[PDB]
Amino acid sequence: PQAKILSQAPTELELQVAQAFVELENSSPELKAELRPLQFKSIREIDVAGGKKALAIFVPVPSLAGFHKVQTKLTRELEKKFQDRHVIFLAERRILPKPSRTSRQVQKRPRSRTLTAVHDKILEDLVFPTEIVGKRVRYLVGGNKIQKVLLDSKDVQQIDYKLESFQAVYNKLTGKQIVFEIPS
């Protein structure tokens, strides 16, 4: 049961999330063909600077469409039973290094496997329910580089409390500073 929905052996912590999945599936009207064949890869744990922790779920790339249909209900229920946590869904997208001049020819790297595209794709899946409506990059006079993300004001009530945790995870997985702002 647990190993069915988990697709890996280590470690202890995600088994509870696997235990959370098998016990939240007592919602049979929606479980059929919308919650059962949907298994994830791994859990990452990231400390939010505000005094809480972030839960990152690593998803197979051709499984995202399943998770997105049930993401809003799965997130709110998982957060409810796992208070003092903010849970997100991140696709496991392989990044290939840029070929060097002296390097030998592997097959041509697709644009989906570039570091820039994956990081932009990380950001889109990070803030899933609302649509990104504009990105800015502030090249600070001291040499820094702060990216700014604009969000469409619809449905932002589901992500207001998670904005700081969004910055913590993205800075953890990319090493790049980022801020959010919702035009209205």
């Binding site: 504009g134 990105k135 800015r136 990059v137 502030r138 090249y139 600070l140 006079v141 040499g143």
Partner: protein, 129 residues
């Protein structure tokens, strides 16, 4: 047609400096334009600059502190050797003490003084003072 997007960007900045404006819009915001502006930003010739990401090629708004006299390009990007760097700085810069010839080099885009410290040389992009 648009042959040099860098020349278009620096021309917009020059016309903004002459009119006394403290901001200017730049389209279509290449990597060379970002790299050229970062050298300007490093030496205090410009202030902040932000990159509007439309999905076409990007736009840039640069904050101008009024400390910049001129920033041109050198088209074509002539091949510059180590001995030829001083000749270019004599021709384009007002004084030996300040101003910078900007070069594109395999070590990266840098000013002419940083090119001497790393002992690298390449093609000339422009100048700033």
């Amino acid at each position: 047609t648009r042959s040099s997007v860098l020349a278009d960007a620096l021309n917009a900045i020059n016309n903004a400096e002459k009119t006394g404006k403290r901001q200017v819009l730049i389209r279509p915001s290449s990597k060379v334009i970002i790299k050229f502006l970062q050298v300007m930003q490093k030496h205090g010739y410009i202030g902040e600059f932000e990159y509007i990401d439309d999905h076409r090629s990007g736009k840039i708004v640069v904050q101008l502190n009024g400390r910049l006299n001129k920033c041109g390009v050198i088209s074509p990007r002539f091949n510059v050797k180590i001995g030829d760097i001083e000749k270019w700085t004599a021709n384009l810069l007002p004084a030996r003490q300040f101003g910078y010839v900007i070069l594109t080099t395999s070590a990266g885009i840098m000013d002419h003084e940083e090119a001497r410290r790393k002992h690298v040389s390449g093609k000339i992009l422009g100048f700033v003072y």
